[PDB]
Ligand binder design. Structure first.
Ligand SMILES: [Zn+2]
Ligand SMILES: [Zn+2]
Ligand SMILES: [Zn+2]
Lengths: 171, 128, 171, 184, 217
């Protein structure tokens, strides 16, 4: 919302900040009033670049920095890969070496051509998918579930503490 | 004022039913049988024949019963009458495709469930 | 889309048709004009499934004609803006593709055609093919087109075909 | 007053007549110079001075009320209004030019050389040959003419940016305004 | 480049979290969890953020650290939050006090217990003597700071002359309660009692007197 305005229609960005960026294969600071303008003609084409987002390729995002928008979306997609837990590797260096390669992949995708990244990602798909990728999908789902359970346990304990001290006072 | 995507329609497209290509073919076929009877009557219009060719080529479900059963399955789901027609007619292969086709379809149901509405119809279409 | 709706139409019956078989004469006459004519508000009308009811005949003073308001059920087809419908290509030309959807005919401008697609004048049958020949569009082929807008004239509706949207064209 | 209004009116003269610019500069003194004293100092013709003062008054710059007493024109330079008047003038102008930009993107797009009858892009079915490919006019089957102007090939326009830049001095002067005084 | 992008991500998250306008929010562990989920910033890589900042900034041969000090403060916050939140809390104030509407919100990371930070002193050093004057009663101090005291004695000054003669005045000339309560703060009678007491006390007391209030307002 801190951006000066859209490259074409920097108006709404001044009147109200309600508009949120729209992510695309192009990687852009697109705005809903401008998304309508893209829908009317082309229907999924970047105005200046003309990149054929035939799917309109639109998804909501909330950060004034377009570079952060693209980086966060690319990281979201990448996290689906190389999600194996650290303890799977006993080697000290290998704990974060693969994370280094992951973030290198993210930076490569942000600016440089993604053809090599896609070919590499196919290579990693084939092998880790045999065993490890689905296993770590399961384990990360388990840890998400248990963290939401633990936060609800914390909030049950806080509600019980509030209501029991109220019943202390009234009793 | 009216958008097929946004599920917005004028005051007349609310109560009337929606007909699929396969079901329409049966309606036209019945008239074709009627045309044979009552000889010396007015011949069908040329525009009428164009509908028969168009619908017959997209008769995904050859059997009459298959059309009714599919409709019954579609009726159960909490979808607008328009949404029932397009999904059967378009015959997308993946849920992501159907998402791009209709923007208002987004958010009505989870992606996995939408894919199931696609695959089950595919199995029925394959079985015929 | 194929919509089965009830229509309110009026019949001007000449007095010469009075006498025996006046009621079915109105029913027979109703099919004469309703079939073969279209209207933008309801789209092309294909057939009248049944006649819901027959109204009372109102006599026009001086004219001698009669006004029969008839409630009948019929299926209509109307293109809607921004929707994808299967279509058949009738004729192929460099400046535009002509496709027919039953009573409805649509014209696709060269600009709406994908940039990588090019007309094949050398081939005896006019057709559009790509450099790699991955996708080829020819007369009497199955394609899906996005309707940019619904425009009508002389009881005839023909729209523009947009192939920019994803999952369009032959497969 | 302050340097705000001084520089403001000094650059505000640039729009109206320079003959009005000298008269505006005479507000160097806020002493509310009378009309006849102005004839002595400005010395512009009584008719020319009258027209100039009335034109400067109409846009709400200055306010004058000669009382009765020799009569003494209550000359002034209303500065509080001045800033708002200039802001609204640019406010309406920025709007009119952007609307002119957007409204210039609509055209028939086609024509026939003879019969000079533009149709619309929608008339493609009528204006076309199943065979020849060239679009042919209805009541003269001899059309070839595509678009006199293809489309907004350029960015929005050099006009909007030219207003943005030529007014950067005005934008900067209104930034120097910066609400120096919270008074009425 | 990787570290710079990490700092960009965390700074964007903090910027948005601060820009949010709402009631004061507290979130010691939930802040870290939400950061990791929203912007994909794992706590373990976040832990070494400040140390890697020091090393990388040293590599750059910068002119001085004064210019980049705010970034170092933000890095210290970033590493601290990922380090621990058991006895801490992140508070967000979209609106500052004493201002109905201000465009300078503040995010606090105020601690709650001093034992966490003073533990190393007690553990490392064999004995620490907190010698203090005007000390409020010692019993609380072991509770606030987790340590086992050896001696708990209060020493009273003894002199041949009574150097100090403290007194408390609660009743004014009107025999009215003079408590400076929040609801009683506005009381003109109480303010008048304070003023008259100060007048007489200044009349009698020799040169030099200091009066301490409860707040600037
Ligand atoms: Zn905009
Ligand atoms: Zn672009
Ligand atoms: Zn002509």
């Amino acid at each position: 919302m801190d951006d000066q305005g859209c490259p074409r229609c920097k108006t709404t960005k001044y009147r109200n900040p309600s508009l949120k960026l729209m992510v695309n294969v192009c990687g852009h600071t697109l705005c809903e009033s401008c998304v309508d303008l893209l829908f009317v003609r082309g229907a999924g084409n970047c105005p200046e670049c003309g990149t054929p987002l035939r799917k309109s390729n639109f998804r909501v995002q909330l950060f004034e920095d377009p570079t952060v928008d693209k980086e966060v979306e690319i990281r979201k997609k990448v996290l689906k890969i190389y999600n194996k837990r650290e303890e799977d590797f006993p080697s000290l260096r290998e704990y974060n070496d693969f994370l280094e390669e992951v973030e290198e992949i993210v930076f490569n995708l942000t600016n440089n051509v993604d053809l090599d990244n896609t070919k590499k990602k196919m290579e990693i798909y084939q092998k880790e998918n045999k065993d490890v990728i689905q296993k770590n999908k399961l384990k990360l789902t388990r840890e998400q579930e248990e963290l939401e359970e633990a936060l609800e346990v914390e909030r049950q304990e806080n509600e019980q503490r509030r209501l029991f001290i109220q019943k202390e006072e009234q009793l | 004022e009216e958008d097929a995507s946004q599920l917005i329609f004028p005051k007349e497209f609310e109560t009337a039913e929606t007909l699929l290509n396969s079901e329409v073919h049966m309606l036209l076929e019945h008239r074709k049988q009627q045309n044979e009877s009552a000889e010396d009557e007015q011949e069908l219009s040329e525009v009428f024949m164009k509908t028969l060719n168009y619908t017959a080529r997209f008769s995904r479900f050859k059997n009459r019963e298959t059309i009714a059963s599919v409709r019954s399955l579609l009726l159960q789901k909490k979808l607008h009458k328009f949404e029932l027609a397009c999904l059967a007619n378009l015959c997308p292969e993946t849920a992501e495709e159907s998402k791009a086709l209709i923007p208002s379809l987004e958010g009505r149901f989870e992606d996995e469930e939408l894919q199931q509405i696609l695959d089950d119809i595919q199995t029925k279409r394959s079985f015929q | 889309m194929f919509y089965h709706i009830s229509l309110e139409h009026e019949i001007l019956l000449h007095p010469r048709y009075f006498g025996p078989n006046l009621l079915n004469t109105v029913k027979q006459k109703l099919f004469t004009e309703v079939e073969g004519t279209c209207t933008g508000k309801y789209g092309f009308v294909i057939a009248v499934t049944t006649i819901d009811n027959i109204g009372a005949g109102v006599i026009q003073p001086g004219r001698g004609f009669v006004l029969y308001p008839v409630k009948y059920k019929a299926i209509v087809f109307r293109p809607f803006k921004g929707e994808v419908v299967d279509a058949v290509v009738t004729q192929v030309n460099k400046v535009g593709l002509f496709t027919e959807i039953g009573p409805m005919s649509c014209f696709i401008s060269r600009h709406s055609i994908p940039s990588e697609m090019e007309f094949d004048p050398n081939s005896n049958p006019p057709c559009y093919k790509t450099m790699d020949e991955d996708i080829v569009i020819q007369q009497d082929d199955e394609i899906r087109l996005k309707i940019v807008g619904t425009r009508v004239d002389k009881n005839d509706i023909f729209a523009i075909g947009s192939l920019m949207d994803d999952y369009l064209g032959l497969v | 007053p302050a340097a705000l209004k001084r520089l403001a009116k000094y650059v505000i003269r640039g729009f109206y007549g320079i003959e009005h610019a000298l008269a505006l500069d005479i507000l160097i003194r806020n002493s509310c110079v009378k009309e006849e004293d102005m004839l002595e100092l400005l010395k512009f013709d009584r008719k020319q001075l009258r027209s100039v003062l009335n034109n400067l008054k109409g846009d709400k710059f200055i306010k004058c009320r000669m009382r009765v007493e020799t009569r003494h024109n209550y000359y002034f330079i209303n500065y509080r209004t001045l800033v708002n008047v200039v802001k609204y003038k640019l406010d309406h102008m920025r709007r009119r030019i952007e609307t002119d930009e957007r409204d210039s993107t609509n055209r028939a797009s086609f024509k026939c050389p003879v019969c000079s009858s533009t149709f619309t892009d929608l008339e493609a079915n009528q204006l076309f040959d199943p065979m020849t490919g060239t679009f042919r006019c209805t009541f003269c089957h001899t059309e070839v003419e595509e678009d006199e102007s293809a489309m907004p090939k350029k960015d929005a326009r050099t006009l909007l940016a030219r207003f943005n830049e030529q007014i950067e001095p005005i934008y900067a002067l209104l930034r120097e305004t910066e609400d120096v005084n919270l008074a009425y | 480049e990787h570290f710079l992008g990490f700092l960009r991500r965390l700074l964007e998250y903090v910027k948005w979290r601060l820009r949010v306008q709402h009631v004061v929010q507290e979130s010691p562990p939930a802040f870290l969890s939400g950061l990791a989920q929203r912007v994909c910033i794992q706590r373990k890589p976040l832990r070494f953020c400040a140390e890697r900042l020091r090393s990388l900034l040293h590599t750059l041969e910068i002119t001085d650290l004064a210019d980049f000090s705010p970034l170092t403060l933000l890095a210290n916050f970033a590493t601290l939050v990922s380090t621990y939140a058991k006895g801490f809390t992140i508070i967000i104030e979209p609106f500052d006090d004493r201002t109905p509407t201000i465009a300078n919100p503040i995010l606090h990371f105020s601690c709650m217990d001093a034992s966490l930070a003073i533990k190393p002193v007690f553990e490392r050093f064999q004995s620490v003597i907190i010698t203090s004057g005007t000390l409020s009663p010692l019993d609380i101090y072991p509770k606030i700071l987790d340590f086992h005291p050896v001696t708990m004695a209060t020493f009273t000054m003894t002199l041949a002359r009574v150097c100090l003669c403290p007194m408390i005045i609660g009743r004014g000339n009107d025999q009215v309660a003079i408590s400076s309560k929040f609801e009683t703060r506005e009381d003109i009678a109480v303010i008048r009692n304070y003023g008259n007491l100060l007048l007489e006390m200044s009349a009698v007391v020799p040169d030099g007197i200091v009066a301490f209030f409860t707040s600037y307002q």
